[PDB]
Amino acid sequence: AFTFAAFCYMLTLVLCASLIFFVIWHIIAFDELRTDARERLKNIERICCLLRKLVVPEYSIHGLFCLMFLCAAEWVTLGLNIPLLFTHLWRYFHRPADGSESIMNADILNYCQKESWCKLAFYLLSFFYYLYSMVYTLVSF
Amino acid sequence: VQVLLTTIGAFSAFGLMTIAISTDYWLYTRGLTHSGLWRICCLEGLKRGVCVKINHFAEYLLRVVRASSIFPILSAILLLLGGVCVAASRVYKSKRNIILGAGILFVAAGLSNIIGVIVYISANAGKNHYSYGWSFYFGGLSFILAEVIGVLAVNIYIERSREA
């Protein structure tokens, strides 16, 4: 019973591994950054640039997930994915600098740590839900 | 040198594309009737000479667009605008962008023309043998002339922008 919704489920399943690896690297980068002359400034600048480059694909891919579900008519899942899309649209993010960070070794660091852990949990939960939906749609044949 | 060639091309193309639509010798078909874009006329029959218009009644979009033959009309408009822009480049010179505007108008003219003929030939067939007259080939020659003067206009613009 191969169907468009099922194929979108598999393709989301493949991309979600990448979507997880991004947040794992973000967690590692935060941990390597918090635990601290000009060499320190160079290190923190390199980490900030890495994070700024890594931010955008993590949002564009989730944009693909929600777009694929909209175009494939799976609303029960699109509803789950909308709140993260809205947060990914800088709803809570202020307008101070384009990058995530100025060392910003303050409560902002703890906030980004906590939200990164939350994002990883959400990604893994969504991954397992996508795997279940794929198996349900295919094996039901 | 080349601005004069662009002007003569612009007005020749406009002349040919305003002679193509007004006159009625597009399609020859059956008695033999030398058709047109607006009016169909009869030949070698009980009636001759004076002649009558076409009747044109979501395929409705094709019917209305073919009827109100908008795309050749717009091609003529665009060619005229390109001609006046090239004319206005000579005066008020060194504008550096009027000539590029002309280069875009003379190409949008080609695109609207080719849509016009695709639509016309698509609506025409809506067995018997037919043939095409000289209004059709004036339209086709106007397309070629429009594209060529468009590339000449961009060439002039590039040369005049590199000279600065």
Binding site: - | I104, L111, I114, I115, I118, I121, S122, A125
Partner: protein, 53 residues
């Protein structure tokens, strides 16, 4: 009813003849081609205007 029938089913059962693809079949791709060209010119002008300022 059938023996005094104007037409018969078997004679024209296949009667298959093939004809050249008219422009009507294809024109749906000519429309897309010209639409793509118009769009390309449009985005070219948008990029030019954005880069000029």
């Amino acid at each position: 009813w059938y023996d005094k029938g104007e037409c018969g089913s078997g004679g024209g059962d296949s009667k298959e003849k093939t004809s050249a693809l008219s422009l009507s079949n294809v024109a749906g791709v000519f429309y897309i081609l010209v639409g793509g060209l118009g769009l390309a010119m449009l985005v070219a002008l948008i990029e030019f205007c954005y880069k000029s300022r």
